[PDB]
Amino acid sequence: TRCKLKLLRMERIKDHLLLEEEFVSNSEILKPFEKKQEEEKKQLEEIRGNPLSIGTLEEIIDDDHAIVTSPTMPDYYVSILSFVDKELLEPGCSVLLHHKTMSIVGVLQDDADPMVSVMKMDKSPTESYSDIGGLESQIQEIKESVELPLTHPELYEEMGIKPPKGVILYGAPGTGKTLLAKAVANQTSATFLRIVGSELIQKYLGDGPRLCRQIFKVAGENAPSIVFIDEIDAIGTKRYDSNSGGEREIQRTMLELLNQLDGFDDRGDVKVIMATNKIETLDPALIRPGRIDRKILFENPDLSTKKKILGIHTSKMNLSEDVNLETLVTTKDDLSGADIQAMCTEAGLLALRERRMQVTAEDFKQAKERVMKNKVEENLEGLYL
Amino acid sequence: GYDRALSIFSPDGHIFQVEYALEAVKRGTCAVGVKGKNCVVLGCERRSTLKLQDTRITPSKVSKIDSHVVLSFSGLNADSRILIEKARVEAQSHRLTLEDPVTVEYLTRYVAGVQQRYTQSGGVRPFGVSTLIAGFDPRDDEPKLYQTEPSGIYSSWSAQTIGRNSKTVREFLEKNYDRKEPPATVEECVKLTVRSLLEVVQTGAKNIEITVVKPDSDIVALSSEEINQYVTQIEQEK
Amino acid sequence: EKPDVTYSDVGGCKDQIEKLREVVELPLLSPERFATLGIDPPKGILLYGPPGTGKTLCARAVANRTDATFIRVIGSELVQKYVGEGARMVRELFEMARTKKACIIFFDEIDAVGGARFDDGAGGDNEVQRTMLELITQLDGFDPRGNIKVMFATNRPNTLDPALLRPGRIDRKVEFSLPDLEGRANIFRIHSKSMSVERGIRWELISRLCPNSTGAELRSVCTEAGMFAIRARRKVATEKDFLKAVDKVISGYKKFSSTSRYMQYN
Amino acid sequence: GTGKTLLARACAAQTNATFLKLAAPQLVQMYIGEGAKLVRDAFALAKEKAPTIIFIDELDAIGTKRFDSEKSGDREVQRTMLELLNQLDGFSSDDRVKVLAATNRVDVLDPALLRSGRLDRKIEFPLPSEDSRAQILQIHSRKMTTDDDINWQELARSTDEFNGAQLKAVTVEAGMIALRNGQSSVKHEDFVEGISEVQARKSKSVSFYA
Amino acid sequence: EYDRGVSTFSPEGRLFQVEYSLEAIKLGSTAIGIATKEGVVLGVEKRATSPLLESDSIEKIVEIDRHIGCAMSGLTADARSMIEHARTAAVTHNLYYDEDINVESLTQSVCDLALRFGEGASGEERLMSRPFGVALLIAGHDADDGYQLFHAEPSGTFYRYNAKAIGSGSEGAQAELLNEWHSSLTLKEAELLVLKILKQVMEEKLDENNAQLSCITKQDGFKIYDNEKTAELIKELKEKEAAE
Amino acid sequence: LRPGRIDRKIEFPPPSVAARAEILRIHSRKMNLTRGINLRKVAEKMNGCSGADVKGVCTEAGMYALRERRIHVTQEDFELAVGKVMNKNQETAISVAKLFK
Amino acid sequence: LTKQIKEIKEVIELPVKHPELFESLGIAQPKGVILYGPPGTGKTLLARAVA
Amino acid sequence: EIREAVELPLVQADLYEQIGIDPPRGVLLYGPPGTGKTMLVKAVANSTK
Amino acid sequence: RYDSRTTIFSPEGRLYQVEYALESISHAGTAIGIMASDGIVLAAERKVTSTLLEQDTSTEKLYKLNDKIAVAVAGLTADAEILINTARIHAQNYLKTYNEDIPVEILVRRLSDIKQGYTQHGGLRPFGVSFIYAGYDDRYGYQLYTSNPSGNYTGWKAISVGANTSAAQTLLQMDYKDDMKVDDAIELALKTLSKTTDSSALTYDRLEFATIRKGANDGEVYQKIFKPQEIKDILVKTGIT
Numbered sequence A: 001t002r003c004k005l006k007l008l009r010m011e012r013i014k015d016h017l018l019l020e021e022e023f024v025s026n027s028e029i030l031k032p033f034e035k036k037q038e039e040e041k042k043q044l045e046e047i048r049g050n051p052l053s054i055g056t057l058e059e060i061i062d063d064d065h066a067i068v069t070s071p072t073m074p075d076y077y078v079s080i081l082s083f084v085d086k087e088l089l090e091p092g093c094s095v096l097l098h099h100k101t102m103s104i105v106g107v108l109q110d111d112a113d114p115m116v117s118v119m120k121m122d123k124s125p126t127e128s129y130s131d132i133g134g135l136e137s138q139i140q141e142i143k144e145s146v147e148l149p150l151t152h153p154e155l156y157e158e159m160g161i162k163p164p165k166g167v168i169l170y171g172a173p174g175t176g177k178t179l180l181a182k183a184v185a186n187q188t189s190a191t192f193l194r195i196v197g198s199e200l201i202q203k204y205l206g207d208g209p210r211l212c213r214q215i216f217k218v219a220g221e222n223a224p225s226i227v228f229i230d231e232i233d234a235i236g237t238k239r240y241d242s243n244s245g246g247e248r249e250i251q252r253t254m255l256e257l258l259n260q261l262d263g264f265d266d267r268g269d270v271k272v273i274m275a276t277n278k279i280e281t282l283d284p285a286l287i288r289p290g291r292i293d294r295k296i297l298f299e300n301p302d303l304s305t306k307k308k309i310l311g312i313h314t315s316k317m318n319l320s321e322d323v324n325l326e327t328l329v330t331t332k333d334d335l336s337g338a339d340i341q342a343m344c345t346e347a348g349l350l351a352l353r354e355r356r357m358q359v360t361a362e363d364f365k366q367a368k369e370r371v372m373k374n375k376v377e378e379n380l381e382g383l384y385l
Numbered sequence B: 001g002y003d004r005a006l007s008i009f010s011p012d013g014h015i016f017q018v019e020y021a022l023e024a025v026k027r028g029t030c031a032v033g034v035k036g037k038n039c040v041v042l043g044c045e046r047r048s049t050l051k052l053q054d055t056r057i058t059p060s061k062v063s064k065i066d067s068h069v070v071l072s073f074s075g076l077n078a079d080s081r082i083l084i085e086k087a088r089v090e091a092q093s094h095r096l097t098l099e100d101p102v103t104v105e106y107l108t109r110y111v112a113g114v115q116q117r118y119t120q121s122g123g124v125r126p127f128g129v130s131t132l133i134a135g136f137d138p139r140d141d142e143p144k145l146y147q148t149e150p151s152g153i154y155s156s157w158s159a160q161t162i163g164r165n166s167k168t169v170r171e172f173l174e175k176n177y178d179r180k181e182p183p184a185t186v187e188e189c190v191k192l193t194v195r196s197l198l199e200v201v202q203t204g205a206k207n208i209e210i211t212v213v214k215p216d217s218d219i220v221a222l223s224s225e226e227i228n229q230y231v232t233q234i235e236q237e238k
Numbered sequence C: 001e002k003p004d005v006t007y008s009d010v011g012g013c014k015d016q017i018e019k020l021r022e023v024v025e026l027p028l029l030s031p032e033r034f035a036t037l038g039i040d041p042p043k044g045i046l047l048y049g050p051p052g053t054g055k056t057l058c059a060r061a062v063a064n065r066t067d068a069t070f071i072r073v074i075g076s077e078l079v080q081k082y083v084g085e086g087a088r089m090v091r092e093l094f095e096m097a098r099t100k101k102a103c104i105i106f107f108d109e110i111d112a113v114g115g116a117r118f119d120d121g122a123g124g125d126n127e128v129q130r131t132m133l134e135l136i137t138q139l140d141g142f143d144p145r146g147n148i149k150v151m152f153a154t155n156r157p158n159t160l161d162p163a164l165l166r167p168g169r170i171d172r173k174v175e176f177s178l179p180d181l182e183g184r185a186n187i188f189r190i191h192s193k194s195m196s197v198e199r200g201i202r203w204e205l206i207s208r209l210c211p212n213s214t215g216a217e218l219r220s221v222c223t224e225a226g227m228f229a230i231r232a233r234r235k236v237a238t239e240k241d242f243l244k245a246v247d248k249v250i251s252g253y254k255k256f257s258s259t260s261r262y263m264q265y266n
Numbered sequence D: 001g002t003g004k005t006l007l008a009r010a011c012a013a014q015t016n017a018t019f020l021k022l023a024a025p026q027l028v029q030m031y032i033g034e035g036a037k038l039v040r041d042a043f044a045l046a047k048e049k050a051p052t053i054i055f056i057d058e059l060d061a062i063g064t065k066r067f068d069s070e071k072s073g074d075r076e077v078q079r080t081m082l083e084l085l086n087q088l089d090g091f092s093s094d095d096r097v098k099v100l101a102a103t104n105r106v107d108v109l110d111p112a113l114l115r116s117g118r119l120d121r122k123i124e125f126p127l128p129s130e131d132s133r134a135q136i137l138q139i140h141s142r143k144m145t146t147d148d149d150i151n152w153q154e155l156a157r158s159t160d161e162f163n164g165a166q167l168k169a170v171t172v173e174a175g176m177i178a179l180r181n182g183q184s185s186v187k188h189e190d191f192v193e194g195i196s197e198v199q200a201r202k203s204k205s206v207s208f209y210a
Numbered sequence E: 001e002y003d004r005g006v007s008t009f010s011p012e013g014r015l016f017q018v019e020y021s022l023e024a025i026k027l028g029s030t031a032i033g034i035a036t037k038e039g040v041v042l043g044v045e046k047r048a049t050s051p052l053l054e055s056d057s058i059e060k061i062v063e064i065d066r067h068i069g070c071a072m073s074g075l076t077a078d079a080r081s082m083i084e085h086a087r088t089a090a091v092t093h094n095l096y097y098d099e100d101i102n103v104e105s106l107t108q109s110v111c112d113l114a115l116r117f118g119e120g121a122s123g124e125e126r127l128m129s130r131p132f133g134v135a136l137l138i139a140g141h142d143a144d145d146g147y148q149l150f151h152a153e154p155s156g157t158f159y160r161y162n163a164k165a166i167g168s169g170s171e172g173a174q175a176e177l178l179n180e181w182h183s184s185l186t187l188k189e190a191e192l193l194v195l196k197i198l199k200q201v202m203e204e205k206l207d208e209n210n211a212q213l214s215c216i217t218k219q220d221g222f223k224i225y226d227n228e229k230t231a232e233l234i235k236e237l238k239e240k241e242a243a244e
Numbered sequence F: 001l002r003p004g005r006i007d008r009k010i011e012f013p014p015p016s017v018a019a020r021a022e023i024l025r026i027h028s029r030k031m032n033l034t035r036g037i038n039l040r041k042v043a044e045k046m047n048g049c050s051g052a053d054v055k056g057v058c059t060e061a062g063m064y065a066l067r068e069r070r071i072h073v074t075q076e077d078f079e080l081a082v083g084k085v086m087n088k089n090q091e092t093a094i095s096v097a098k099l100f101k
Numbered sequence G: 001l002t003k004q005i006k007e008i009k010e011v012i013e014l015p016v017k018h019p020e021l022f023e024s025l026g027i028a029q030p031k032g033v034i035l036y037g038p039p040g041t042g043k044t045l046l047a048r049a050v051a
Numbered sequence H: 001e002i003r004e005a006v007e008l009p010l011v012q013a014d015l016y017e018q019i020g021i022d023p024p025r026g027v028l029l030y031g032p033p034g035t036g037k038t039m040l041v042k043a044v045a046n047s048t049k
Numbered sequence I: 001r002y003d004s005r006t007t008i009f010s011p012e013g014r015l016y017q018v019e020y021a022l023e024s025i026s027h028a029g030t031a032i033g034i035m036a037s038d039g040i041v042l043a044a045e046r047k048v049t050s051t052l053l054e055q056d057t058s059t060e061k062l063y064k065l066n067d068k069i070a071v072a073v074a075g076l077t078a079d080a081e082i083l084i085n086t087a088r089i090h091a092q093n094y095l096k097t098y099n100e101d102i103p104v105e106i107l108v109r110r111l112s113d114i115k116q117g118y119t120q121h122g123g124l125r126p127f128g129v130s131f132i133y134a135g136y137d138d139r140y141g142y143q144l145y146t147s148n149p150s151g152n153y154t155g156w157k158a159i160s161v162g163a164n165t166s167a168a169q170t171l172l173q174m175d176y177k178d179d180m181k182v183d184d185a186i187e188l189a190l191k192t193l194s195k196t197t198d199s200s201a202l203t204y205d206r207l208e209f210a211t212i213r214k215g216a217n218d219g220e221v222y223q224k225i226f227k228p229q230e231i232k233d234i235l236v237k238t239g240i241t
Ligand SMILES: Nc1ncnc2c1ncn2[C@@H]1O[C@H](COP(=O)(O)OP(=O)(O)OP(=O)(O)O)[C@@H](O)[C@H]1O
Pocket: A131, A132, A133, A134, A135, A172, A173, A174, A175, A176, A177, A178, A179, A180, A275, A276, A277, A301, A308, A309, A312, A337, A338, A341, F002, F004
């Protein structure tokens, strides 16, 4: 309790005093510059009238003119002139005209699409780095290809050459792969895009590769950026339709990836992570190196490792009353870290029947049996016996 | 890939039906073989499905084919059952021809032979059973251990493990075992077997079953009590 | 726009690359050379080979050398379910390039928009092949093109349409191949030129232990030797860390790929 | 690659008549029923300026063997094939106006497309014969250096299964050999090594029996 | 289609299904045989997937006569049937003529069982239902042609050779044999030659558990070596390359 | 079915002779009882396999009762409703196929 | 259908009402709960009734 | 079934409330176009007033 | 996908056709053996019934294969029919050759091969029959086994096959007694059969019964199939009727 408070002490005072400051300061910002700034405001105001007719920029010709196509429909041969530059104007941007004579009075707008919402994440994970605990030899591997050449470029010029491009995290289910992508991206504070590979298939034909253009068009502007393609195993035999998604599309989406990630485009400075549960499902040319470099293989966590993973989950819990925690790990052999999170889930479910608020040691032993029974089928030892 | 059928080859050169046949072996009970110098011990996990299961009349996982060759299996129990009977008609027949008892080297070929035959053909599936055949020769007293696999390929190993998490026992075995000196006392060699089998049962001393072959047509099945004493030695030291 | 990749970053001493420089670059740079003979030289060139052999590396390198607008076309931008839309993209692009003088139009990775005609009575592959038909007619033309060099990098020329492949304007078909045994040393010395290294190293030994392979794998020996440099807290790379680095990439490659042998007990 | 396109362009421009430039892949457009409209404007342009020859580049975009379809945008494709038939339907002043059309695939063209009343003549172009091959060589070689060492009847025989575009790729590729030498002259040998450039092989067979 | 048939031809004129069987032959262990004017030396690589594997009680060089030996790679399963048939043929020849069987002729019999693929095809009554995933290096000596090395291919027929490699390392081994062979060789030279090429195409360490030579020398008969003999030749090799 | 996302499995059984009779009643109670109780006779003959059956029994009975033209719904209408829902589900089983297997 | 009502109250109702209960336990809140069986038994109607 | 849908709750709405049975709702006619679907709608529209 | 013929495996080393053949079993009625040292009861339930199905003139889910071994059937009765004939023919073959009524083990082992054989060889269908073998042989006394359609066997102290295998097994092992009585064994079979079966009242006509005993007069082995009226009376005693 008194440890919690020390943290709670700094947090309250400092930000709430800054809030009280910013509130008073809204006024105060105007006061030191009110004759450069209101002078500028005046001159801005005078040329552009009201309203500001928004058009969408098709293209500029570099000579101080442009062709715009408004949404209100008419096309106009505008001038690039006044409070606007040729470098600020790039296709697909939304430009500000003055209504009565279309002169480009500025640009204040580039994005407003529903599409780009999809790619970005407003994320807040409940497990951050150092709740990836154990398998530390191989977290060290994802660091070297994602985290550490962002954090020090020093090391990758001290060795010379390029920093290795991308990675594939692959192996058995439950091995903590998801939590890796979300947690290494916590460390860096890079833009975490996330798209699934069951969302890379589309219910419209030939829109699938257009979507795959969107992922690294987004990546490239918000860079440095970490693009998670989660579950790209779903490319080989999982598809929404056949006469309006079809066979053509599945192959095309993969062709599209090639051009994005090491085509002319090249698109340097996007770290790519691909989680896939089977790398023998994946395309031979997407498991070509030099767009995803080295592969990291994970396996069902080993006997000492599952100590780590049991401590991560039972730190939340009220602990064992008699303690048999060290023997739980021993009984399990060749088993996932997802079995460990389903075991502390299962212990507190048995506890949840009572609608008691404590948890005791004995629930652990029961809960392990319950969830092992669920795994094993009646035709496995039907087929066998 | 090219699992639609057995006879068609594969770009990858691996007949899929054999590969999946192996996978089936992992279903069944673990069996381990360890040779001595004067012994072979052939032990197997005897996994108990329910407490209503008899020990009165219910089959052991280890089957003597003839009176000095012993056989365990791992795999599809249904399939093993005819494989063991076919092995046996030939085995006995070996004496009809020669007036010599069954040699372990002739026997592994034969068991691999019925299996190879089934694979070669197209209108049968392979046996989903890998077997360990342990024994000594009639003529001589050096311990012999063989394996057959689904494929129809046979090998000799010093000690070898198959079925139910075979990998983990295999590694265990490497570390413990010595090829310079295999144990030359029947008891210590048994003890190595028990330690292996402990692992896959997790807990049991009524689910570890040990059988031993010794030379000159000695085959014995060990008392449930006798195995528990060995487990007692292994738990104390640990 | 072009990057700063030259054919000094593209290795071997390959004749294969020089087929590129006499077809694309030489007739734009000086067509005087080809007027001594009186010949008309190629327009087109078909580029093919295994992945990671440097198809795209020569698309980067040919862009810098000519100083001609580089275009470039993605072979999977050209499909929607609204039909003949990829015919608009291909048509307008090809007409646009007539007006620019000295261009290279680089269609990357065509194996879609480069299949073949099929009618099946319930098909769907048909919609896509429409747009390839526009490309043929734009290429040969109502009138012939010239001073447009079209390069085609194909991953698979086995799909590639018979009537783009025939060499009526794709006169020169050059396979870009695996590097040779002493070919692989030259390549590996371009990547280690950036790489910080200490003399007492024999690169020709590191080539000899590596089998015939891609230059992407040759980048996986340099990178892999380099993260062992970071961990040891040495700034340089030396020979011993190259030894582990080739062994890691060869041995790891079998695991990803398919192998389910009947030789795992014998 | 048998020189269909080239003959048409050349001999239509030779006689004097209106030469329309129309493309099959064009007829299929992304806007509904506009693609049909465009067939009607092409025949209109032919009828003002009649006689006209309308040379259609390709014929396999509308050379669709489907108009029995299932869940597709293919009903737009075959719609402009039917419109072609309505504007080759008699309707007056259409006798004068013809259609040339080149295609690479006859086996996927519709059986209502190909049949008299519409296409009346069905003329096949084979792979060029041994003499015919010979003739093509000399016709490109009348624009570049020619030596009297060369014998064009020799080269013809040794090209076996060469279509006319491959024969442009004997003569082009000879000048590629001559430049790589650094010669300012093409020799007869350069032509033999011009034959080795295209063959549909790289000088192989692939066998496990011979 | 062409490849999922068994007697279905592809548009290039290759029986694809049968083509695919060649990659079965390669999966197995490397064996390199080199014919000489003194005898044929046949070496193998034998894989150890465990220290616990008894690599020295398994072999892939086998005895077929007293002057015919065979190397093999592929399915030892299909090697059991291919080797068994060939043993029968040698013995039945011996029954019929009381005379040595020629190297080539033993090969004709091994290629007859190979022909059979079918379930309707005529020539001989087809009873065997697939190709054989296994090759042979056939070694012997008749005195009227000398020492000879032939290669059996189950997808083709008998090829005469002065040297062949088969197995995984075949492709690179073959270059070295193009480079170093001679007609000026003795069997002593020839033995250290199998070993010098073998090691480079080996990924396992060069030791006696993963190796094994045999020879067809007419005088000595078919002789499988010792592990003690094979270990000697590894040393003599090491001495040679240091000098070199 | 990946672990750590499934830990509770709620199987619905096909509701027994007693169990269906309580859901049957709730849709009776919408209308007006037979007033001598014949519900339970309806519910024990019918072995059914679905709770969708028993709301439809009540719909059919009320449509027979319309023909009849009475405020009261008689129990003879609930004899016909069961005999029809029950007969129809034996045509999905292609005769008495349980017998033949 | 009374046991299935008990069953859904465990994993949907209690983590809404009391999210204090599952923190004290330390049990992480459920994602999938498969509601399954013969059609027409009450599967859609159960997740409705609790809403 | 369609004089049951249309004609009987139009005139005798009281009888449906008296049993406690729900009103009839929308009427779907579906099947191949040979089936006479239209013919009946025309028919029942005249008779139902 | 792999739901085809029998040569082919699934890449998980499953033959789908043995797995489905198991599932065939629980679409025919419950069948229970409970072993006791006083005798074995075999009890069975009818898959379905009507009011004019005659089932008091014959049995058709309890067959004698010989004069000391008898079987209860659960599963397809067509598949059953051929296998019962083959078993019975063999039972007398053993009689002719050795002058002993066939051991329980030799008979189960034979039939396990035969079931296995139809899966393994050719294109023939596997069998989807579970037979509870209840026998006497003078080696092991009293013996219970059951055989899977898979073509293997296990010995039991109690087993349930047919519909409602899991529940019927649970209630059996809950109240099981190691020594038991023959009389109690009959009672525990009605108690379980009531809760597992969805028939409202449990009628004599939904039951077949046979008992194999050596304790109903020693020196001899007596197979006593209960007639309808004996079945009808014992329901009374246990107060279900
Ligand atoms: N080494 C570990 N340290 C901490 N927690 C672990 C560890 N490994 C696994 N976990 C726990 O197991 C949970 C389940 O695994 P997770 O969702 O990350 O799957 P995965 O292996 O990527 O499977 P797939 O991607 O095929 O669906 C993790 O979210 C985490 O709580």
